[PDB]
Symmetry: D2
């Protein structure tokens, strides 16, 4: 069941907007940049960031989709700044899988990672470059990220089964 | 003599814009917020942030100005979120004085600090909540912050003498 | 009611030992340093630190006791690196009162901050230089630090009515 | 030219000792922990950390060696806390290669990374869990790590043409 809300629609909107500005700032423009969404909600987050960047800089950013699932759609990559987008950073194992998939498709100038929430408990020396919000959790708790495009609403909560 | 430019006009713009978004985000809105610029350059930086915030939230924010030297433009304080604004965070000593002044005027809910650049070398346990850019410097180097309103251009550089 | 135990005697012991090494490391030896314990329990932590450092460096370190009650023990301050020692870093207002109290005694070369736990919720631009453990908490939760010298046991827990 | 010495023998000594306590501290001991050094100097730093951890816990930590050139030696992996050890963390591409190598030999409980120096300029979403010293650098500077076992002396410096 749901224990508590840690991000409402407004907090998610402001977080994603501030991230877009962070991406633009740390790359001095989105030139050579590419957003690649993971799983399902990461893709929707990626598309939102692309629109925000486009809205801010006037330049559009390519959005690609990556389907990990196993290994535990095409796009630029080569000599590009590949920014992975995902909803929650946990153990970090998915990112590793995602990185292999990126360099299996080319050689990027670099790979970055943007997540809506970092809930800690990393099991790999991996960190997000951009973070919507750091949400302290116990190892057993569950982070549920709901996005309007798939869940009907924007909300991040902590659950416990 | 100018040793190196660490922030050009565009970098300063993207930093101040991102900071404005960080400010609204952590405060979940502008309500109760008060920007207090510190003598000279910190004042202009507070004005620029106040404008960016207004542009973002559709509502303006109270902007006061603090002359730390004079302490040896009034504004709200009590139960307010006072965001001190300065150009460079250095030893941190100047910030303590700024805190004493703010609380001389009232009892704020919180005091925050935003600086364009944090050049390290603190001599007190004070850290900025918002930082335009962290600029490592030696103990002998000088940080020169130029703002268009006073120096004709927006630029941050490292000087040696 | 006790909601959780976040540090047992072994964790506390290992955090304190590691901090002693961090203190020596960041100051390139303990020459000119002074450990000033705050309130009540910060005094014991400072004593344990002084003892650990002594056994590591083979050189003793001055220990003072500061009561910050008035700001909310004849020890060296001026020209010294005053390392404040407290049990918990919360809003940081205790630190501001402590910095004021230290400035009424002398002119330190610099002031640092070491705490056993940082539970977040800062209301001032203050951060510890050394932290035993970051214990995320809700605003309504209480951090209880028990030390053998005063409570019969070493333990840090989270309480809430 | 050697334009700056960032770590001398004593600093390295105190940094490694501090790292050992941190490692033990975050793992609540070393039970199930394995140290794995890469390239050449990482191996030496791993042996040292291993030596330091023995004097603290009274038990040896397995030490493995990893040759990465073929990615761009025994030790248990599965269910173990594998601690990668390298001298410098730069782009982080070596670490990604090192990780693939680790999970090629098994399924560890977690993989952590310890490095003597972090010089920034990450090109992958990788971070070290234990850092001897963060040394800011320009893109054209080079980090040279000298260890007595191979270079006759312990020293970290910044070089530039």
């Amino acid at each position: 069941m749901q224990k508590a809300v840690v991000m409402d629609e407004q907090a998610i909107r402001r977080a994603l907007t501030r991230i877009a500005h962070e991406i633009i700032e740390r790359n001095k423009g989105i030139d050579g940049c590419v957003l690649v969404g993971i799983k399902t909600r990461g893709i929707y987050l990626a598309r939102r960031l692309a629109e925000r960047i486009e809205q801010i800089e006037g330049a559009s950013v390519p959005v690609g989709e990556l389907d990990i699932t196993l290994y535990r759609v095409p796009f630029p990559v080569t000599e590009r700044n590949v920014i992975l987008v995902d909803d929650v950073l946990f153990t970090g194992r998915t990112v590793r899988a995602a990185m292999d998939a990126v360099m299996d498709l080319g050689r990027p100038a670099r790979i970055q990672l943007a997540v809506l929430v970092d809930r800690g408990h990393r099991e790999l020396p991996i960190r997000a470059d951009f973070v919507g919000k750091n949400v302290p959790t116990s190892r057993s708790e569950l982070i549920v990220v709901e996005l309007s495009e798939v869940d009907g609403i924007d909300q991040v909560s902590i659950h416990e089964k």
